Amino acid sequence: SMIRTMLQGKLHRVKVTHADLHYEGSCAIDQDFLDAAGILENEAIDIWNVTNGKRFSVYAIAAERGSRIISVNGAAAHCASVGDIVIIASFVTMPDEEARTWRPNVAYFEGDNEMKRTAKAIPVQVA
Amino acid sequence: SMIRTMLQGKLHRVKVTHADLHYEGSCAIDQDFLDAAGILENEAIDIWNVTNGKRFSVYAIAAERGSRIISVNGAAAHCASVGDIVIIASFVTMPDEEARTWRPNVAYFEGDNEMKRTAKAIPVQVA
Amino acid sequence: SMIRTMLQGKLHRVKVTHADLHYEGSCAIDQDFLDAAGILENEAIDIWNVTNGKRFSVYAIAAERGSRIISVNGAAAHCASVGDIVIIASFVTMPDEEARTWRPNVAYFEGDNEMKRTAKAIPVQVA
Amino acid sequence: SMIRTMLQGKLHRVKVTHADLHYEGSCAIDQDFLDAAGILENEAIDIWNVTNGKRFSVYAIAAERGSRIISVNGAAAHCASVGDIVIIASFVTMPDEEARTWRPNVAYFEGDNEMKRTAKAIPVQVA
Amino acid sequence: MKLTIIRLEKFSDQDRIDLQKIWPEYSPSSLQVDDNHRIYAARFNERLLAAVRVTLSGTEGALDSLRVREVTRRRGVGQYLLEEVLRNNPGVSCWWMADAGVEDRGVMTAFMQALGFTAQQGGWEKCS
Amino acid sequence: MKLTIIRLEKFSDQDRIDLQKIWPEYSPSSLQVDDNHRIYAARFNERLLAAVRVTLSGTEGALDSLRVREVTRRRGVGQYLLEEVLRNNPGVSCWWMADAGVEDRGVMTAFMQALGFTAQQGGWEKCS
Amino acid sequence: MKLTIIRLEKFSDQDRIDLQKIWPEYSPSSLQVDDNHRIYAARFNERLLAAVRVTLSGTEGALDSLRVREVTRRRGVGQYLLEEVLRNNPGVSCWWMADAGVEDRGVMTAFMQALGFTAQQGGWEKCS
Amino acid sequence: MKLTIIRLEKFSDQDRIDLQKIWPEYSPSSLQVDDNHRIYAARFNERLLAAVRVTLSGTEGALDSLRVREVTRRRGVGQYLLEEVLRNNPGVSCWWMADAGVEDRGVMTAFMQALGFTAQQGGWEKCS
Ligand SMILES: CC(=O)SCCNC(=O)CCNC(=O)[C@H](O)C(C)(C)COP(=O)(O)OP(=O)(O)OC[C@H]1O[C@@H](n2cnc3c(N)ncnc32)[C@H](O)[C@@H]1OP(=O)(O)O
Ligand SMILES: CC(=O)SCCNC(=O)CCNC(=O)[C@H](O)C(C)(C)COP(=O)(O)OP(=O)(O)OC[C@H]1O[C@@H](n2cnc3c(N)ncnc32)[C@H](O)[C@@H]1OP(=O)(O)O
Ligand SMILES: CC(=O)SCCNC(=O)CCNC(=O)[C@H](O)C(C)(C)COP(=O)(O)OP(=O)(O)OC[C@H]1O[C@@H](n2cnc3c(N)ncnc32)[C@H](O)[C@@H]1OP(=O)(O)O
Ligand SMILES: CC(=O)SCCNC(=O)CCNC(=O)[C@H](O)C(C)(C)COP(=O)(O)OP(=O)(O)OC[C@H]1O[C@@H](n2cnc3c(N)ncnc32)[C@H](O)[C@@H]1OP(=O)(O)O
Ligand SMILES: [Mg+2]
Ligand SMILES: [Mg+2]
Ligand SMILES: [Mg+2]
Ligand SMILES: [Mg+2]
């Protein structure tokens, strides 16, 4: 009954395609990307912006499958601009014993949001 | 037993009616608004300020039903001013299988905090 | 099985007595104050600084009972100074049905950290 | 069924050995350090930077055992530089009755990330 | 912006691209709009998600060509669109929708019933 | 500011608006205040939420017209108001409240008992 | 940067230090690389974690000396390295890996099977 | 700063105030310190929490007057203090602590046993 908070999945280095203060507050994500990282519509997500250093939390909504959209909408549009490179993460909680064997859903992107690889682990950083 | 954090409900684009550092720290919200979004007295809430970009977390208290009050009180009054347009959100946790079918409680506002619509879903953003 | 995040208790407008970057990182709190608000040693707490507007999260440690100490230690000492007036809050999670009847542990202070009142509810803000 | 958020463990005053925006976003930590503080690969962690005052949340990945590495990678590298002194913390949730007797896993460092002491409690701060 | 139901009197180029996706079977012009022949659409984040054609004859009104983009179904768009059409035409006391072109009549029936319409031969009626 | 119990000696215009909401049956003036005829009120975020009239006769004291705004009941306002009235009048050893005007005597009794008062014929007493 | 599979044509000093850790039994030079004798490696955060030698003979290809650093095993590095070697050599229809130097043949077999290879006498084959 | 075990050779005014709280029965001076008569203390956030007197006679060493402030007991302060005293006096092979002044001998015994000491008549010994 000790419960851990674990990285569930992440979209690594996606590029923001739209950022508009007047769009409905949320981050809209291509449904294919949500599926690859295991992120649900309406789920809380953290966004870490590699371009400008800002870190903020919002919730995900769906964008049309195959659009490659990453739309930072509403008040969140203060925190990102079109063309920024961001990491989008979701966290889940589970008991300690399950956490020890947990494998997160990682998806990697290059170019104009082309998905290059999905994986279940991050390697160890060596000296 | 993997637990998700999901948007429970939100007040979309309410306007701050009062902001005072000397009032008791909290965000006081018209009880009708709390009911529409499913937000409880004493519940933790996040506030995203569309006017100034600030994002902060506090807790809700009740304001008189029908007053249309959104009062940003205490230290939080550093983060919002009268007339700012804010999104107020609450998050809940539930198991993965329930999260997949979860529908949040959304309420939309225009003008001087006139409630225009309640809904149970946010549409998909298309290209 | 929908779980809410609720205000557990708060220390309202305590004054910082010590702030030192070289002290062990934590916020040390008079044990009487911890007891009044229901805050545990080692529990995560949020601190909202009314004087300077900063909002930060740390964890509580105990200070000698009756010392009236509120010591903001380590990296947190970047966020508060001696004589600042702060609100210290802890949040718990519980099921929705319990959350509806939950009463938080509130303690109010004046002067040099003299505890004036404990309560189990915050009133409704009227027009 | 009231659930508390408790400090699980901490690395006290480790020094950042690497900080690179182009490395894969994460904080990589010597496996010996993770073991001492009870922190898991893929677990959410908070980082409090004593040198520059920044506070940010990310997730842990492993670095080679015995390397003494603390690598602040990706967008997080906006928040720390080589040679900064940081506190790295993880939080768990548990029921109130367990929280009352909980002992966190604390590890203390001096010099070039030499581990000097592990402990299960933080003392009381006296007047 | 948030989901909003609008009455379309002039079409932008973006409205034409979107209307083509909603109704690939029409090629507008072909879509004459005037006081009694109206198009209402559901707009969200600068795009049209759903549209319906309305024909008014005073106290009688007819609906045709109701379609919500498949990608955004079951999110309350269709319901809000029809609710708003009815609210914005308070003079109409009898509404008819024919079953023409409907791809799945049982889904249509369950939707229409949710909106207070009765199933009849050839379509659905709400005649308060 | 936080809930605070105050003794009202002069009324601002805001106090008059609030007192009208607490006591619509009184129209002040009509509310003479002097050393022995006191009004205590509960203030929260610049508004009065509850008030009570106190009449002092040395070691004997009387309370009337206790009302907390319905919107903010069962949040400890009434309790704090009476606690503070008693603490700020330490010379009074016997307190009386008549049952006049009380809308729900069983709720009043349970409140008064919580505050250490005994139910008697015609009201409630605390005579330490 | 993220885990990336590279073909090594020239070695930096860092590549030499890392290759020594991956293959302490080789002392390069000794590692001649040319068009048909290739080294592919897995790079992560500016370090090599795993490497394999590839010998090409047109439609036939041979793999030897596959090793992932023990510290980073069972994190998908070996799988990605071989997947990428196969994808980047689409002209090869038959691949062979001999069992030479393999420390634990049963682990190797389970890995190779996961990658579509069949166990044979003396090694593993994938001959689409 | 973090809990640190120090050897006290000179006393600040703050050390004197703290030592008075740890040992109200001593009034220092009275506390002569020299090479063989040492005081070790546990410091945390600029205050002393616990102290012990050590008397050295080469390979034999004696401990007396071990006390941790009651407010901070059972947080590992006493253990760390004695561990550090032993580690910083590696020439001593036999340690003695008499049971003099101990308020609760059963708690003392359980502590001393946790630190590797054996209970004897009149005190505790660790004679590696
Ligand atoms: C050229 C031409 O256009 S010809 C006309 C062609 N049109 C068609 O073929 C219709 C194609 N279908 C659609 O466009 C849509 O599916 C519609 C209009 C039927 C429904 O629109 P939606 O936006 O998906 O419906 P909405 O989410 O508002 O549903 C409201 C209610 O209707 C009912 N409903 C909707 N879809 C369904 C379904 N698939 N099954 C059962 N009930 C349903 C439910 O009661 C629902 O409420 P709930 O979700 O709270 O349970
Ligand atoms: C002109 C004139 O004014 S004439 C006088 C007219 N006055 C009236 O008719 C009284 C109208 N009622 C009220 O104003 C209020 O309901 C009061 C004064 C009775 C109680 O004030 P409140 O602020 O709601 O009470 P408060 O929250 O301080 O309650 C303290 C305790 O009293 C008891 N109590 C209060 N309300 C109730 C209730 N409805 N049922 C049962 N017990 C109750 C409980 O023990 C409670 O403690 P708890 O919540 O820890 O259980
Ligand atoms: C000079 C010379 O180099 S001579 C050659 C010497 N080489 C050797 O002795 C090989 C030493 N071993 C290794 O280098 C590695 O253990 C390898 C290459 C066998 C596997 O590399 P890894 O990066 O650990 O494997 P990877 O994580 O990609 O595994 C992929 C799949 O293989 C299988 N597999 C890998 N390791 C194991 C294991 N220990 N047990 C069972 N199955 C395994 C699993 O199916 C796994 O998929 P899963 O994790 O989803 O279950
Ligand atoms: C003038 C003079 O000073 S004369 C000398 C007077 N001294 C006394 O009377 C001693 C007064 N007591 C004390 O000062 C303290 O209680 C001490 C020294 C006995 C223990 O110091 P503490 O800092 O509380 O002990 P610490 O937390 O390091 O305990 C280490 C271990 O000892 C044991 N222990 C300590 N206290 C207790 C206890 N009350 N009950 C059982 N076991 C205990 C446990 O094994 C514990 O390890 P754990 O917590 O992992 O279970
Ligand atoms: Mg819909
Ligand atoms: Mg009340
Ligand atoms: Mg691997
Ligand atoms: Mg101790």
Author numbering:
A (entry chain A), B (entry chain A), C (entry chain A), D (entry chain A): 0 to 126
E (entry chain B), F (entry chain B), G (entry chain B), H (entry chain B): 1 to 128
Show me the paper's own sentences about this structure.
PanD (encoded by panD) is post-translationally modified to form its catalytically active form, ADC, by cleavage of the peptide backbone between residues Gly24 and Ser25, leading to the formation of a pyruvoyl cofactor from Ser25. In addition, we show that PanZ acts as a CoA-dependent inhibitor of ADC catalysis.
Bipyrimidal crystals were reproducibly obtained using a 1.1-fold excess of PanZ over PanD(T57V) and a 2-fold excess of AcCoA, with respect to PanZ. X-Ray diffraction data were collected from these crystals to 1.7 Å resolution at room temperature using an in-house X-ray source. The crystals contained a single PanD protomer and one PanZ molecule per asymmetric unit. The structure of the protein complex revealed a highly symmetric heterooctameric complex. The binding site for AcCoA is very close to the protein-protein interface, accounting for the previously observed CoA dependence of the interaction (Monteiro et al., 2012). In particular, binding of AcCoA appears to stabilize the PanZ Leu66-Gly76 loop, which forms contacts with PanD. The location of the peptide backbone in the immediate region of eventual peptide cleavage (Glu23-Cys26) in the PanD zymogen is largely similar to that observed in the PanD-AcCoA.PanZ complex, although the exact conformations of individual residues, particularly the carbonyl of Gly24, have changed.
